[PDB]
Design a protein around this ligand. Sequence first.
Ligand SMILES: O=C(O)c1cccc(Cl)c1
Length: 167
Amino acid sequence: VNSFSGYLKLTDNVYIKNADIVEEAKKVKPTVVVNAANVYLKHGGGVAGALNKATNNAMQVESDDYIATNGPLKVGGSCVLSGHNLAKHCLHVVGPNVNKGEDIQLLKSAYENFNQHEVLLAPLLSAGIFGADPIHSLRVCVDTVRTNVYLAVFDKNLYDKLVSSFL
Ligand SMILES: O=C(O)c1cccc(Cl)c1
């Protein structure tokens, strides 16, 4: 049993809810929240901007030190940093950004990072401002992640379309 409430069950391991991911993290304090990161960990907008704002910019300060030491992530890659006031840990995952021309086949590699964690609160990778089709992102999620994932969909309209169209 876990703390997640109000989710629709899609599969054995994947759950979905219409929710602001910043508000869900604050309520649950999950072990892992996933950030929709870029390779520079520049948390300017979208999920990243919202998560970072909720940490009062402490996520960005920590991230800048990580990049200064390690250099940029890979598209499809990830790193584990603090969850600050939102979670124990933040898994920063880089899905491909279609608005930068990145290979959508890297979306599966991105989701494979989730398999290193038994339970996660996450957004749909490469969705929102990243430019990919969220229906496709949900399909890749279900067909890639084997650990227990609780997906937070920001738009109510999109949430209802993802559920209604789910095979
Ligand atoms: O695209 C999203 O899921 C998103 C974008 C910005 C803020 C939030 Cl809470 C969510």
